[PDB]
């Protein structure tokens, strides 16, 4: 009761509750996915609309020509973190005339998210990202949780109902390294479909796709631009 009011008050079991509630906020958001092959990395998302007249919320953003993210949780926090990532990438290009290696960006992200969870009165970043990038070491996928704890995944799926998606991903992890771009995108779409609630099908109105690779800047497919990818499922 009194151990879940501040982020600096350890609970008698060695747990900080506020961080866990922030994790909850990240788990209540709409589903998203990430993959990496030996050649590409593909994010696949599922937007949802408050009503039938409103648009479906954007949930893939640009960071650099070689990095992309996919959010799940409070938007404002996601916007703040996008601002941070983009400023870091630009500073790396200005100082070093070179793309920022992805791992280092994820490390800075973790460190920035760490300060809130150790000072009185500050609160954890209530957003969960899925960063996809392509550095000199090749494709990468990462995950970030409100606790400043990032993970180097080969496939993941955060958000609401994301566990069936994770099951399908762990089910077919062998093929991802050898797949073509099309097969990879179809794996991602199929999992995110496993997440959908029964009588609801994948449509051009509730899907967005991001891709980055060897000779391909990060590009976002949405609306009818996604139809070529969907047609085939």
């Amino acid at each position: 009761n009194q151990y879940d009011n501040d982020v600096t008050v350890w609970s008698p079991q060695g747990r900080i509750h506020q961080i866990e509630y922030a994790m909850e906020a990240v788990k209540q958001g709409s589903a998203t996915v990430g993959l990496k092959s030996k050649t590409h990395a593909v994010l696949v998302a599922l937007k949802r609309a408050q009503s039938e007249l409103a648009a479906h919320q954007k949930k893939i953003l640009h960071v650099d020509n070689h990095i992309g993210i996919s959010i799940a949780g409070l938007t404002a926090d996601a916007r703040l973190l996008c601002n941070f990532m983009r400023q870091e990438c630009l500073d790396s290009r200005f100082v070093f005339d070179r793309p920022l290696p992805v791992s280092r960006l994820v490390s800075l992200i973790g460190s920035k998210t760490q300060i809130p969870t150790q000072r009185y009165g500050r609160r954890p970043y209530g957003v969960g990202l899925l960063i996809a990038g392509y550095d000199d070491m090749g494709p990468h996928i990462f995950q970030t949780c409100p606790s400043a704890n990032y993970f180097d995944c080969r496939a993941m799926s955060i958000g609401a109902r994301s566990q069936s998606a994770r099951t399908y991903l762990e089910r077919h992890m062998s093929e991802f390294m050898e797949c073509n771009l099309n097969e990879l995108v179809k794996h991602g779409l199929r999992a995110l479909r496993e997440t959908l609630p029964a009588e609801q099908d994948l449509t051009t109105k509730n899907v967005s796709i991001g891709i980055v690779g060897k000779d391909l800047e990060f590009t976002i497919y949405d609306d009818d631009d996604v139809s070529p990818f969907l047609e085939g499922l």
Binding site: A25, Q28, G29, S30, K47, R48, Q50, Q57, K59, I71, A72, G73, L74, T75, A78, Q163, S164, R166, T167, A198
Partner: protein, 146 residues
């Protein structure tokens, strides 16, 4: 724990506690009867009762871990006619912070929902709806989260 307070009544419970203490390990050693006990709070029990001569072996029972959650669910759903598609690893993963006494709710409520929908055999969605029942969560009238 005993304490120095002007309010009466608790002294009588303390006093029967002293008597139990003495019965466990005291004059006239008793070596034929053994004692068990269970408590949710061990931070309030008297040191003379957690002493290393009366209550020697103390055993901890942790909130079950993923493997434990799958095991518990499996044990309790053993009688019900379940389909061969339920992935108990999934059901373990989507059941964080679930004390062991909770699949009983999940297992049974999945059966109940199968009855409601006039079914005969259970399916993954039945267990998922059971879980959403057991968590007992309320909405805030809106879903601004992305």
């Amino acid at each position: 724990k005993r304490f120095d307070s002007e309010k009466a009544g608790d002294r009588e419970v303390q006093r029967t506690m002293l008597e139990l203490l003495n019965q466990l390990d005291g004059f006239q050693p008793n070596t034929q009867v053994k004692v068990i006990a269970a408590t949710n709070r061990v931070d309030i029990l008297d040191p003379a009762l957690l002493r290393s001569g009366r209550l020697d072996r103390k055993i901890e029972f942790p909130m079950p871990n993923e493997e434990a959650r799958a095991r518990i669910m499996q044990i309790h759903s053993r009688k019900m006619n379940v389909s061969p598609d339920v992935n108990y690893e999934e059901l373990a993963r989507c059941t964080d912070d679930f004390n062991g006494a909770q699949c009983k709710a999940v297992c049974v409520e999945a059966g109940m929902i199968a009855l409601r929908r006039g079914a005969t055999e259970l399916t993954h969605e039945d267990y998922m709806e059971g879980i959403l029942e057991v968590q007992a969560k309320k909405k805030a009238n809106l879903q601004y989260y992305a």
